[PDB]
Amino acid sequence: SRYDVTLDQSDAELVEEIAWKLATQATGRPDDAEWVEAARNAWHAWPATLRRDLAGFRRDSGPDGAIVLRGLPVDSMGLPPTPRVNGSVQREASLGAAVLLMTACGLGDPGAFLPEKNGALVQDVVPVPGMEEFQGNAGSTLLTFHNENAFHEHRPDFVMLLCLRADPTGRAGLRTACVRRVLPLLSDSTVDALWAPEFRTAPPPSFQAPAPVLLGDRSDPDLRVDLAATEPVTERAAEALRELQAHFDATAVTHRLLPGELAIVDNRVTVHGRTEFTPRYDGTDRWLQRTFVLTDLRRSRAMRPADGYVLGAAP
Ligand code: NA
Questions:
Q1: How far is the CA of 147 from the centre of ligand 1 (A)?
Q2: Which of 197, 298, 177, 296 lies closest to 240 in space, CA to CA?
Q3: Residue 137 annotated as part of some ligand binding site
Q4: According to a count of CB atoms within 10 Å of the terminal CB, is the N or C end of the chain lower?
Q5: How many CB atoms lie within 10 A of CB 11?
Q6: 44 is in an annotated binding site
Q7: Do the bridges between strand 174-178 and strand 158-165 make them parallel or antiparallel, or are there none, so unpaired?
Q8: Residue-range domains of the chain with CATH
């Protein structure tokens, strides 16, 4: 499958060399524009095979709206214990930051939101004691299906998750479900409901009108939904969300990520969630790093002071 790519040894070694050079030699640190520039330049040193694979995915993300790359460099011997604080981010140069920011610059540009993880471009996904029930990075209860930052006009176009350390307990898996798999299975009444402006997705409290869930083309729509946050404004809308959830559940691909695996989710067409797990809280738990990609950074300029990578309020 061209949506499941394992790097061959030659390509894996080259990307490792490139990532280490960026991580150790580039001036500044990942959130600095000069480091993102070094990452952009380093991306273009990647093997053509992988650049072609990513370009193909950007053009058409396929029936599941997701790709996984396996065999990317991660510093397993050098990895510290899994962080255990909420809001954990990667401010220092590292191999994980190098891989994520290079790939972001290949697909578009990286971006982040000031009210979420303090606008860091590379964010940790790690379980935190006391946050078990949270619908977010720090939680370990079932994470309900959603588009990332569904409320936001400039929500991520892609969400990238690089696995540093697998969940040792075997119960955690990333779940992705694409509107392309479910649209043909939905009832006419549900489809009609999802095109109507009868859903309210209010911003989270940290970020300080009724609209449709389905967007764009009738046969190949985008979608905008968060099954935790999106509120139906009518009864048919409520029924539509229940049917949509059911079909997401039935058609979702579930992935237990392993070190060196990079999952890239097309957030225009694919929702994601996560199964429940019981953290150990002993430094050995699941550790992903996450970076958002904007396919056209220019569109959010009004929200990006100094033409930076951190989106805040407009106008
Ligand atoms: Na998410």
A1: 7
A2: 197
A3: yes
A4: C
A5: 18
A6: no
A7: unpaired
A8: 1-315 (3.60.130.10)
